CSV table of N, CA and C (backbone and C1' of nucleotides) in Angstrom, one decimal:
chain,number,residue,atom,x,y,z
F,1,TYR,N,38.3,-8.3,-40.2
F,1,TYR,CA,39.1,-8.6,-40.8
F,1,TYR,C,38.0,-9.6,-42.2
F,2,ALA,N,37.5,-10.5,-41.5
F,2,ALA,CA,36.1,-11.4,-41.5
F,2,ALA,C,35.0,-10.8,-42.1
F,3,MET,N,34.5,-10.0,-41.7
F,3,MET,CA,33.3,-8.7,-42.4
F,3,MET,C,33.7,-8.7,-43.2
F,4,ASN,N,35.3,-7.5,-43.2
F,4,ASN,CA,35.6,-6.8,-44.5
F,4,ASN,C,35.8,-7.9,-45.7
F,5,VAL,N,36.3,-9.1,-45.5
F,5,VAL,CA,36.7,-10.2,-46.7
F,5,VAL,C,35.2,-10.6,-47.3
F,6,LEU,N,34.2,-10.4,-46.0
F,6,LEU,CA,32.9,-11.2,-47.0
F,6,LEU,C,32.3,-10.1,-47.4
F,7,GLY,N,32.1,-8.5,-47.3
F,7,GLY,CA,31.2,-7.8,-48.1
F,7,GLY,C,30.0,-7.3,-47.3
F,8,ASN,N,29.9,-7.3,-46.0
F,8,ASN,CA,28.7,-7.0,-45.9
F,8,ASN,C,28.8,-5.7,-45.1
F,9,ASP,N,28.3,-4.5,-45.9
F,9,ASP,CA,28.5,-3.5,-45.7
F,9,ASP,C,27.0,-2.9,-45.2
F,10,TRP,N,27.3,-1.4,-44.5
F,10,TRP,CA,26.2,-0.8,-43.6
F,10,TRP,C,25.2,-0.7,-44.4
F,11,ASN,N,25.2,-0.2,-46.0
F,11,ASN,CA,23.9,-0.2,-47.0
F,11,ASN,C,23.4,-1.4,-47.5
F,12,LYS,N,23.5,-2.6,-47.2
F,12,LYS,CA,23.2,-4.1,-47.3
F,12,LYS,C,22.4,-4.5,-46.3
F,13,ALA,N,21.9,-5.5,-46.8
F,13,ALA,CA,20.7,-6.8,-45.9
F,13,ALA,C,21.6,-7.2,-45.2
F,14,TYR,N,20.5,-7.7,-43.7
F,14,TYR,CA,21.3,-8.3,-43.1
F,14,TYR,C,21.4,-9.6,-43.4
F,15,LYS,N,22.5,-10.2,-42.4
F,15,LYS,CA,22.8,-11.5,-42.9
F,15,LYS,C,22.9,-12.3,-41.5
F,16,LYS,N,22.9,-13.6,-41.2
F,16,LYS,CA,23.2,-14.4,-39.9
F,16,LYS,C,24.4,-14.6,-39.5
F,17,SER,N,24.1,-14.6,-38.0
F,17,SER,CA,25.4,-14.8,-37.8
F,17,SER,C,26.1,-15.7,-37.4
F,18,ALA,N,25.8,-17.0,-37.5
F,18,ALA,CA,26.0,-18.4,-37.6
F,18,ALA,C,26.7,-18.6,-38.6
F,19,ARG,N,26.5,-17.8,-40.0
F,19,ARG,CA,27.9,-17.9,-41.2
F,19,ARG,C,29.1,-17.6,-40.7
F,20,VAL,N,29.2,-16.1,-40.6
F,20,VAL,CA,30.4,-15.4,-40.1
F,20,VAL,C,31.2,-15.9,-39.1
F,21,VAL,N,30.0,-16.7,-37.8
F,21,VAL,CA,31.3,-17.4,-36.7
F,21,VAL,C,31.8,-18.5,-37.1
F,22,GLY,N,31.1,-19.4,-38.1
F,22,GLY,CA,31.8,-20.0,-38.8
F,22,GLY,C,32.8,-20.1,-39.8
F,23,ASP,N,32.7,-19.1,-40.6
F,23,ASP,CA,33.9,-18.4,-41.2
F,23,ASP,C,35.3,-18.5,-40.3
F,24,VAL,N,35.1,-17.0,-39.4
F,24,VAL,CA,35.9,-16.9,-38.6
F,24,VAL,C,36.6,-18.2,-37.5
F,25,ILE,N,35.5,-19.2,-37.3
F,25,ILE,CA,36.2,-20.0,-36.8
F,25,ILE,C,37.2,-21.0,-37.8
F,26,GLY,N,36.9,-21.4,-39.2
F,26,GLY,CA,37.4,-22.0,-40.0
F,26,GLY,C,38.5,-21.7,-40.8
F,27,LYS,N,38.9,-20.0,-40.9
F,27,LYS,CA,39.7,-19.8,-41.2
F,27,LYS,C,40.7,-19.0,-40.6
F,28,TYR,N,40.2,-18.1,-39.3
F,28,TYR,CA,41.6,-17.1,-38.5
F,28,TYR,C,41.4,-17.4,-36.9
F,29,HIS,N,40.2,-17.9,-36.6
F,29,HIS,CA,40.4,-17.9,-35.4
F,29,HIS,C,39.8,-19.3,-34.9
F,30,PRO,N,40.3,-20.8,-34.8
F,30,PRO,CA,39.9,-21.5,-34.4
F,30,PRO,C,40.3,-22.3,-33.0
F,31,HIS,N,39.0,-21.3,-32.3
F,31,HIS,CA,39.5,-21.5,-30.7
F,31,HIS,C,37.8,-21.8,-30.4
F,32,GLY,N,37.6,-21.7,-30.6
F,32,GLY,CA,36.0,-22.4,-30.5
F,32,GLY,C,34.6,-21.6,-30.4
F,33,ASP,N,33.4,-21.7,-30.2
F,33,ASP,CA,32.9,-21.0,-30.6
F,33,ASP,C,32.2,-19.9,-29.9
F,34,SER,N,31.9,-20.3,-28.5
F,34,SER,CA,31.4,-19.4,-27.9
F,34,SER,C,32.0,-18.1,-27.3
F,35,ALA,N,33.4,-17.8,-27.2
F,35,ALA,CA,33.9,-16.6,-27.3
F,35,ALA,C,33.7,-15.6,-28.2
F,36,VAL,N,33.6,-16.5,-29.5
F,36,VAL,CA,33.5,-15.0,-30.6
F,36,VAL,C,32.2,-15.1,-30.1
F,37,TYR,N,30.9,-15.7,-30.5
F,37,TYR,CA,29.7,-14.9,-30.1
F,37,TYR,C,29.7,-14.4,-28.8
F,38,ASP,N,30.3,-14.9,-28.2
F,38,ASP,CA,30.4,-13.0,-26.9
F,38,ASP,C,30.6,-11.8,-27.0
F,39,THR,N,31.7,-12.1,-27.9
F,39,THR,CA,32.4,-11.1,-28.4
F,39,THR,C,31.6,-10.0,-29.4
F,40,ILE,N,30.6,-10.9,-30.2
F,40,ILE,CA,30.0,-10.5,-31.1
F,40,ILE,C,28.4,-9.8,-30.1
F,41,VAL,N,28.3,-10.5,-29.4
F,41,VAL,CA,26.5,-9.9,-28.4
F,41,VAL,C,27.6,-8.6,-27.6
F,42,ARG,N,29.0,-8.4,-27.1
F,42,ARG,CA,28.9,-7.5,-26.2
F,42,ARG,C,29.5,-6.2,-27.6
F,43,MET,N,30.1,-6.6,-28.5
F,43,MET,CA,29.8,-5.9,-29.1
F,43,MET,C,28.7,-5.0,-29.6
F,44,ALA,N,27.5,-5.3,-30.1
F,44,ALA,CA,26.8,-5.7,-30.3
F,44,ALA,C,25.5,-4.5,-28.8
F,45,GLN,N,26.1,-4.6,-27.8
F,45,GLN,CA,25.0,-4.0,-26.9
F,45,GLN,C,25.2,-2.6,-26.6
F,46,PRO,N,24.3,-1.8,-26.7
F,46,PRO,CA,24.5,-0.5,-26.8
F,46,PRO,C,24.8,0.1,-25.7
F,47,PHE,N,24.7,-0.5,-25.1
F,47,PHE,CA,25.1,-0.2,-23.2
F,47,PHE,C,26.3,-0.6,-22.4
F,48,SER,N,27.1,-1.1,-22.9
F,48,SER,CA,28.0,-1.6,-22.8
F,48,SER,C,29.7,-0.7,-24.2
F,49,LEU,N,29.8,-0.4,-24.9
F,49,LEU,CA,30.5,0.6,-25.9
F,49,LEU,C,30.0,1.7,-25.7
N,1,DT,P,30.5,72.7,11.2
N,1,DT,O5',30.3,71.9,12.4
N,1,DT,C5',29.5,70.9,12.3
N,1,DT,C4',29.6,69.6,13.6
N,1,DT,C3',29.9,70.3,15.0
N,1,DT,O3',28.9,69.7,15.9
N,1,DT,C1',31.7,69.1,14.8
N,2,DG,P,28.2,70.0,17.1
N,2,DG,O5',28.8,69.6,18.3
N,2,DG,C5',28.7,68.0,18.5
N,2,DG,C4',30.1,67.6,19.2
N,2,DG,C3',30.6,68.1,20.3
N,2,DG,O3',30.3,66.7,21.2
N,2,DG,C1',32.1,67.6,19.2
N,3,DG,P,30.3,66.8,22.8
N,3,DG,O5',31.6,66.6,23.0
N,3,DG,C5',32.8,65.8,22.4
N,3,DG,C4',33.4,64.8,22.9
N,3,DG,C3',34.5,65.0,24.2
N,3,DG,O3',35.2,64.2,24.3
N,3,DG,C1',35.6,66.8,22.3
N,4,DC,P,36.1,63.7,25.5
N,4,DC,O5',37.6,63.8,25.7
N,4,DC,C5',38.2,63.1,24.5
N,4,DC,C4',39.8,63.5,24.3
N,4,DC,C3',40.6,63.4,25.8
N,4,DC,O3',42.1,63.5,25.5
N,4,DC,C1',40.4,65.6,25.0
N,5,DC,P,42.7,63.0,27.0
N,5,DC,O5',43.6,63.4,26.9
N,5,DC,C5',44.4,63.7,25.6
N,5,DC,C4',45.7,64.4,25.6
N,5,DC,C3',46.6,64.9,27.0
N,5,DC,O3',47.4,65.3,26.3
N,5,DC,C1',45.3,67.4,26.7
N,6,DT,P,49.0,65.4,27.9
N,6,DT,O5',49.3,66.8,28.0
N,6,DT,C5',49.4,67.7,26.7
N,6,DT,C4',49.2,69.3,27.4
N,6,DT,C3',49.9,69.5,28.7
N,6,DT,O3',50.8,70.5,28.4
N,6,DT,C1',48.0,70.5,28.9
N,7,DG,P,52.4,71.1,29.1
N,7,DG,O5',52.1,72.7,29.5
N,7,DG,C5',52.0,73.6,28.5
N,7,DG,C4',51.3,74.9,29.3
N,7,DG,C3',51.7,75.4,30.4
N,7,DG,O3',52.1,76.9,30.3
N,7,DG,C1',49.5,74.5,30.6
N,8,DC,P,53.2,77.8,31.5
N,8,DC,O5',51.5,77.9,32.5
N,8,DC,C5',50.7,79.1,32.0
N,8,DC,C4',49.9,79.2,32.8
N,8,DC,C3',50.4,79.4,34.1
N,8,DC,O3',50.0,80.8,34.8
N,8,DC,C1',48.7,78.2,34.6
N,9,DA,P,50.7,81.8,36.0
N,9,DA,O5',49.5,81.5,37.5
N,9,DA,C5',48.3,81.4,37.1
N,9,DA,C4',47.4,81.1,38.1
N,9,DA,C3',47.9,81.3,40.0
N,9,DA,O3',46.3,81.7,40.6
N,9,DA,C1',46.9,78.9,39.2
N,10,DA,P,47.5,82.3,42.1
N,10,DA,O5',46.0,80.9,43.4
N,10,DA,C5',45.1,80.8,43.2
N,10,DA,C4',44.2,79.5,43.6
N,10,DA,C3',44.9,79.6,45.0
N,10,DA,O3',43.5,79.0,45.7
N,10,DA,C1',45.1,77.7,43.4
N,11,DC,P,43.4,79.0,47.3
N,11,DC,O5',43.8,77.8,48.0
N,11,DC,C5',42.0,76.8,47.3
N,11,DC,C4',42.5,74.8,47.3
N,11,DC,C3',42.9,75.0,49.4
N,11,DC,O3',42.0,73.7,49.5
N,11,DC,C1',44.7,74.1,47.1
N,12,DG,P,41.8,73.6,50.7
N,12,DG,O5',42.2,72.3,50.8
N,12,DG,C5',41.7,71.1,49.6
N,12,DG,C4',42.8,69.6,50.2
N,12,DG,C3',43.4,69.2,51.8
N,12,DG,O3',43.7,67.7,51.2
N,12,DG,C1',45.3,70.1,50.3
N,13,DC,P,42.7,67.2,52.1
N,13,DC,O5',43.3,65.7,51.9
N,13,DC,C5',43.8,65.1,50.8
N,13,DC,C4',45.6,64.5,50.8
N,13,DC,C3',45.4,63.7,52.4
N,13,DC,O3',46.3,62.9,52.0
N,13,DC,C1',47.5,65.8,52.3
N,14,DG,P,45.7,61.7,51.6
N,14,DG,O5',47.2,60.6,51.3
N,14,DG,C5',48.1,60.9,50.6
N,14,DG,C4',49.5,61.1,50.7
N,14,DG,C3',49.9,60.1,51.6
N,14,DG,O3',51.4,59.8,51.4
N,14,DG,C1',50.3,62.1,52.7
N,15,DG,P,51.8,58.7,50.6
N,15,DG,O5',52.8,59.3,50.4
N,15,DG,C5',53.6,60.3,50.2
N,15,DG,C4',55.3,59.7,49.9
N,15,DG,C3',55.8,59.0,50.5
N,15,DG,O3',57.1,59.0,50.0
N,15,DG,C1',55.5,60.6,52.0
N,16,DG,P,58.7,58.2,50.7
N,16,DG,O5',59.0,58.7,52.0
N,16,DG,C5',59.2,59.8,51.6
N,16,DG,C4',60.0,60.3,52.8
N,16,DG,C3',60.7,59.5,54.3
N,16,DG,O3',61.9,60.2,54.4
N,16,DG,C1',58.7,60.8,54.6
N,17,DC,P,62.7,59.2,55.3
N,17,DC,O5',62.6,59.4,57.1
N,17,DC,C5',63.0,61.0,57.3
N,17,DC,C4',63.0,60.5,59.1
N,17,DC,C3',62.9,59.1,59.8
N,17,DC,O3',63.0,59.8,61.3
N,17,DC,C1',60.9,59.4,60.0
N,18,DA,P,64.0,58.7,62.2
N,18,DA,O5',62.3,57.6,62.5
N,18,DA,C5',61.7,58.6,63.0
N,18,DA,C4',61.5,58.0,64.7
N,18,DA,C3',62.0,56.7,65.2
N,18,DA,O3',62.8,57.5,66.0
N,18,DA,C1',60.3,56.4,64.4
N,19,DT,P,62.9,55.5,66.9
N,19,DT,O5',61.1,55.2,67.9
N,19,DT,C5',60.6,56.0,68.4
N,19,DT,C4',59.5,55.2,68.6
N,19,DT,C3',59.2,53.8,69.2
N,19,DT,O3',58.4,54.0,69.9
N,19,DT,C1',58.0,53.6,67.4
N,20,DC,P,58.5,53.0,72.0
N,20,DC,O5',57.4,52.5,72.1
N,20,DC,C5',56.2,53.6,71.9
N,20,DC,C4',54.8,52.5,71.7
N,20,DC,C3',54.9,51.1,72.7
N,20,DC,O3',53.5,51.0,72.7
N,20,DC,C1',54.6,50.7,70.1
N,21,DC,P,52.8,49.7,73.5
N,21,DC,O5',52.1,48.8,71.8
N,21,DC,C5',51.0,49.4,71.9
N,21,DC,C4',50.7,48.7,70.9
N,21,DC,C3',50.3,46.8,70.8
N,21,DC,O3',49.6,46.6,70.2
N,21,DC,C1',51.7,47.1,69.3
N,22,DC,P,48.3,45.2,70.3
N,22,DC,O5',48.8,44.7,69.2
N,22,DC,C5',48.6,45.0,67.3
N,22,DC,C4',49.0,44.7,66.3
N,22,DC,C3',49.2,43.2,66.4
N,22,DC,O3',48.3,42.9,65.2
N,22,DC,C1',51.3,44.0,65.8
N,23,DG,P,47.4,41.4,64.9
N,23,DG,O5',47.9,41.0,63.4
N,23,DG,C5',48.1,41.5,62.4
N,23,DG,C4',49.1,40.8,61.7
N,23,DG,C3',49.0,39.2,61.7
N,23,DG,O3',49.3,38.5,60.0
N,23,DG,C1',51.1,39.3,62.3
N,24,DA,P,48.8,37.4,59.6
N,24,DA,O5',50.4,36.9,59.2
N,24,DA,C5',50.7,37.1,58.0
N,24,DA,C4',52.1,36.9,58.1
N,24,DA,C3',52.5,35.4,57.5
N,24,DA,O3',54.0,35.5,56.9
N,24,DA,C1',53.0,36.5,59.2
N,25,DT,P,54.4,34.1,56.3
N,25,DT,O5',55.7,34.5,56.5
N,25,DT,C5',56.2,35.0,57.4
N,25,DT,C4',57.2,34.5,58.3
N,25,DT,C3',57.2,32.6,57.8
N,25,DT,O3',58.3,32.3,58.0
N,25,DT,C1',57.0,33.0,60.1
N,26,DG,P,59.6,31.6,56.5
N,26,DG,O5',61.1,30.6,57.9
N,26,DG,C5',61.6,32.1,58.0
N,26,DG,C4',62.3,31.1,59.4
N,26,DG,C3',62.3,29.7,59.1
N,26,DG,O3',63.8,29.6,59.5
N,26,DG,C1',60.8,30.1,60.8
N,27,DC,P,64.4,27.8,59.6
N,27,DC,O5',64.2,27.0,60.8
N,27,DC,C5',64.5,28.3,62.0
N,27,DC,C4',63.6,27.1,63.2
N,27,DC,C3',64.1,25.4,63.2
N,27,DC,O3',64.5,25.2,64.1
N,27,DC,C1',61.5,26.0,63.3
N,28,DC,P,64.8,23.3,63.8
N,28,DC,O5',64.2,22.7,65.2
N,28,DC,C5',63.3,23.4,66.3
N,28,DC,C4',62.4,22.5,67.4
N,28,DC,C3',62.7,21.1,66.7
N,28,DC,O3',62.1,20.8,68.5
N,28,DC,C1',60.1,21.9,66.0
N,29,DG,P,62.8,19.1,68.8
N,29,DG,O5',61.5,18.1,68.1
N,29,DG,C5',60.5,18.5,69.7
N,29,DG,C4',58.4,18.0,69.2
N,29,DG,C3',58.6,16.4,69.1
N,29,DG,O3',58.3,16.4,69.6
N,29,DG,C1',57.5,18.0,67.0
N,30,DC,P,57.6,14.3,69.5
N,30,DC,O5',56.4,14.4,69.1
N,30,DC,C5',54.9,15.0,69.4
N,30,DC,C4',54.0,15.0,68.5
N,30,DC,C3',53.1,13.7,67.5
N,30,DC,O3',51.8,13.5,68.0
N,30,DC,C1',53.5,15.2,66.1
N,31,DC,P,51.1,12.2,67.6
N,31,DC,O5',50.1,12.8,65.8
N,31,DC,C5',49.7,13.2,66.2
N,31,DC,C4',48.5,13.0,64.5
N,31,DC,C3',48.4,12.7,64.1
N,31,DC,O3',47.1,12.7,63.3
N,31,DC,C1',49.9,13.2,62.8
N,32,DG,P,46.2,11.1,62.5
N,32,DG,O5',46.4,12.3,61.2
N,32,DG,C5',45.8,13.2,60.3
N,32,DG,C4',45.8,13.7,58.6
N,32,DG,C3',45.4,13.0,58.0
N,32,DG,O3',44.8,13.3,57.0
N,32,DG,C1',47.5,12.7,58.0
N,33,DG,P,43.6,12.6,56.2
N,33,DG,O5',44.1,13.2,54.8
N,33,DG,C5',44.4,14.5,54.3
N,33,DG,C4',45.7,13.7,52.9
N,33,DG,C3',45.1,12.7,52.2
N,33,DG,O3',45.6,12.5,51.0
N,33,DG,C1',46.9,12.0,53.0
N,34,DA,P,44.6,14.0,50.1
N,34,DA,O5',45.8,14.2,49.0
N,34,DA,C5',47.4,14.2,48.8
N,34,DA,C4',48.0,13.8,48.1
N,34,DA,C3',47.5,12.4,47.2
N,34,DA,O3',48.4,11.7,45.8
N,34,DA,C1',48.2,11.3,48.8
N,35,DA,P,48.9,13.4,45.2
N,35,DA,O5',50.4,12.9,44.7
N,35,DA,C5',51.3,12.7,45.9
N,35,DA,C4',52.1,11.3,45.1
N,35,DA,C3',52.4,11.0,43.6
N,35,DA,O3',53.2,10.2,43.3
N,35,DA,C1',50.9,9.7,45.0
N,36,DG,P,54.5,11.0,42.9
N,36,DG,O5',56.1,10.0,43.7
N,36,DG,C5',55.4,9.1,44.8
N,36,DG,C4',55.4,7.4,43.7
N,36,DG,C3',54.7,7.7,42.2
N,36,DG,O3',55.3,7.9,41.3
N,36,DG,C1',53.9,5.7,43.9
N,37,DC,P,55.2,8.1,40.1
N,37,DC,O5',55.6,6.8,39.3
N,37,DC,C5',56.3,5.6,39.4
N,37,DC,C4',55.5,5.0,39.4
N,37,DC,C3',55.5,4.3,37.9
N,37,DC,O3',55.8,2.3,37.9
N,37,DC,C1',53.4,3.9,38.7
N,38,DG,P,57.2,1.7,37.3
N,38,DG,O5',57.1,0.5,38.3
N,38,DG,C5',55.9,0.4,39.4
N,38,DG,C4',55.7,-0.8,39.5
N,38,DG,C3',55.4,-1.7,38.2
N,38,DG,O3',56.0,-2.7,38.0
N,38,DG,C1',53.5,-0.8,38.7
N,39,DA,P,55.9,-4.2,37.1
N,39,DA,O5',53.9,-4.2,37.4
N,39,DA,C5',53.2,-5.2,38.8
N,39,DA,C4',52.1,-5.1,38.3
N,39,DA,C3',51.5,-6.3,37.4
N,39,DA,O3',50.7,-7.2,37.6
N,39,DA,C1',50.7,-4.5,37.7
N,40,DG,P,50.6,-9.0,37.4
N,40,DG,O5',49.1,-8.7,36.7
N,40,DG,C5',48.0,-8.4,38.1
N,40,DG,C4',46.8,-7.7,37.4
N,40,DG,C3',46.4,-8.9,36.4
N,40,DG,O3',44.6,-9.2,36.6
N,40,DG,C1',46.0,-6.7,36.1
N,41,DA,P,44.0,-10.3,35.8
N,41,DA,O5',43.1,-8.9,35.0
N,41,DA,C5',42.1,-8.1,36.0
N,41,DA,C4',41.3,-7.5,34.5
N,41,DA,C3',40.6,-7.6,33.8
N,41,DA,O3',39.6,-7.5,33.4
N,41,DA,C1',42.2,-6.3,32.7
N,42,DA,P,38.7,-8.8,32.1
N,42,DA,O5',38.1,-7.3,30.8
N,42,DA,C5',37.7,-5.9,31.8
N,42,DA,C4',37.7,-5.2,30.4
N,42,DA,C3',36.8,-5.2,29.1
N,42,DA,O3',35.9,-4.3,28.7
N,42,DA,C1',39.1,-4.1,29.6
N,43,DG,P,34.7,-4.5,27.5
N,43,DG,O5',35.4,-3.8,26.8
N,43,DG,C5',35.5,-2.2,27.4
N,43,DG,C4',35.9,-1.7,26.3
N,43,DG,C3',35.9,-1.0,24.8
N,43,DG,O3',35.7,-0.8,23.6
N,43,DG,C1',38.1,-2.3,24.8
N,44,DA,P,34.7,-0.2,22.7
N,44,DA,O5',36.3,-0.1,21.8
N,44,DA,C5',36.7,1.1,21.7
N,44,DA,C4',38.1,1.2,20.8
N,44,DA,C3',38.2,0.7,19.4
N,44,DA,O3',39.1,1.7,18.6
N,44,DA,C1',39.3,-0.6,20.2
N,45,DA,P,38.1,2.1,17.0
N,45,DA,O5',39.5,1.9,15.9
N,45,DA,C5',41.0,2.9,17.3
N,45,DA,C4',42.4,2.7,15.9
N,45,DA,C3',42.0,2.4,14.7
N,45,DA,O3',43.0,2.4,14.3
N,45,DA,C1',42.2,0.0,15.9
N,46,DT,P,43.3,2.2,12.6
N,46,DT,O5',44.2,0.8,12.3
N,46,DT,C5',44.9,0.4,13.3
N,46,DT,C4',46.0,-0.6,12.8
N,46,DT,C3',46.0,-1.3,11.8
N,46,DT,O3',46.9,-2.2,11.5
N,46,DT,C1',44.5,-3.3,12.8
N,47,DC,P,47.5,-2.2,9.3
N,47,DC,O5',48.1,-3.9,9.7
N,47,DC,C5',48.3,-4.3,10.8
N,47,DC,C4',48.3,-5.9,11.0
N,47,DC,C3',48.4,-6.8,9.7
N,47,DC,O3',49.0,-8.1,9.8
N,47,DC,C1',46.2,-7.1,10.5
N,48,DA,P,49.3,-8.5,8.3
N,48,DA,O5',48.6,-10.1,7.9
N,48,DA,C5',48.8,-11.5,9.7
N,48,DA,C4',47.6,-12.1,9.1
N,48,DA,C3',47.0,-13.1,7.7
N,48,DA,O3',47.1,-14.2,8.0
N,48,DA,C1',44.8,-11.7,9.0
N,49,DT,P,47.2,-15.4,6.8
N,49,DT,O5',46.0,-15.3,6.6
N,49,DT,C5',44.7,-16.3,7.3
N,49,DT,C4',43.6,-16.5,7.4
N,49,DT,C3',43.6,-17.0,5.4
N,49,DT,O3',42.9,-17.8,5.4
N,49,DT,C1',42.3,-15.1,5.7
N,50,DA,P,42.8,-18.9,3.7
N,50,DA,O5',41.4,-18.2,3.4
N,50,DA,C5',40.5,-18.6,2.6
N,50,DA,C4',38.9,-18.3,2.9
N,50,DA,C3',38.1,-18.5,1.5
N,50,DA,O3',36.4,-19.0,1.8
N,50,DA,C1',37.9,-16.8,2.3
N,51,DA,P,35.5,-19.6,0.2
N,51,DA,O5',35.3,-18.3,-0.1
N,51,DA,C5',34.9,-18.3,-1.0
N,51,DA,C4',34.0,-17.1,-2.1
N,51,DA,C3',33.8,-16.9,-2.7
N,51,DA,O3',31.9,-17.0,-3.6
N,51,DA,C1',34.5,-15.1,-2.2
N,52,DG,P,30.8,-16.3,-3.0
N,52,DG,O5',31.1,-14.9,-4.2
N,52,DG,C5',30.2,-13.4,-4.0
N,52,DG,C4',29.9,-12.6,-4.6
N,52,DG,C3',30.3,-13.2,-6.4
N,52,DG,O3',29.2,-12.8,-7.0
N,52,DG,C1',32.2,-12.3,-6.0
N,53,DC,P,28.8,-12.8,-8.2
N,53,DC,O5',29.4,-12.0,-9.4
N,53,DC,C5',29.7,-10.4,-9.2
N,53,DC,C4',30.3,-10.2,-9.9
N,53,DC,C3',30.5,-10.5,-11.6
N,53,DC,O3',29.9,-9.3,-12.0
N,53,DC,C1',32.6,-10.3,-10.3
N,54,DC,P,29.4,-9.0,-13.7
N,54,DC,O5',31.5,-8.6,-14.6
N,54,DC,C5',31.3,-7.3,-14.9
N,54,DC,C4',32.7,-6.9,-15.1
N,54,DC,C3',33.5,-7.7,-15.7
N,54,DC,O3',33.3,-7.2,-17.4
N,54,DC,C1',35.1,-7.9,-14.2
N,55,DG,P,32.7,-8.0,-18.7
N,55,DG,O5',33.6,-8.4,-19.2
N,55,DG,C5',34.9,-7.9,-20.0
N,55,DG,C4',35.2,-9.1,-20.5
N,55,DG,C3',34.7,-9.8,-21.6
N,55,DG,O3',35.6,-10.5,-22.7
N,55,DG,C1',35.9,-11.5,-20.1
N,56,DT,P,34.9,-10.6,-24.0
N,56,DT,O5',35.8,-11.1,-24.9
N,56,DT,C5',36.4,-12.9,-24.4
N,56,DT,C4',37.6,-13.2,-24.2
N,56,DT,C3',38.1,-14.5,-25.0
N,56,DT,O3',39.3,-14.6,-25.3
N,56,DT,C1',38.3,-14.5,-22.8
N,57,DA,P,39.7,-15.4,-26.5
N,57,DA,O5',40.0,-16.8,-25.1
N,57,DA,C5',39.8,-18.3,-25.5
N,57,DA,C4',40.5,-18.8,-24.8
N,57,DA,C3',40.1,-19.8,-24.7
N,57,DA,O3',40.8,-21.6,-25.5
N,57,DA,C1',40.4,-19.4,-22.3
N,58,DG,P,40.0,-22.3,-26.2
N,58,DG,O5',39.8,-23.7,-25.0
N,58,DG,C5',41.2,-24.4,-24.5
N,58,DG,C4',41.0,-24.7,-23.2
N,58,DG,C3',40.4,-26.1,-22.6
N,58,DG,O3',41.3,-26.4,-23.1
N,58,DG,C1',39.9,-24.1,-20.9
DNA sequence: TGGCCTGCAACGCGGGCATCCCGATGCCGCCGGAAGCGAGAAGAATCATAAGCCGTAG
């Protein structure tokens, strides 16, 4: 939902992950930073999904 | 297509009968072995008590 509200489509340029992590911690998931980053890494691994 | 079962006819040998000689055997007495499973001991299958990682959380 945060990535959709931010407006980062597939046909756009890349963006830094720290901004997205900070936004998620600030608005919706204020439960640390390690879990969100680990979830992002897990979603980014091709051999994991 | 080749071989087998059976009817007809001819031949032979053994079933039955008795008994004399005979071989097992039931019984009796004396001696042997194995069973008797109960118990002691060893081996093995199974049960009971720690970790390692799977991913977000502190």
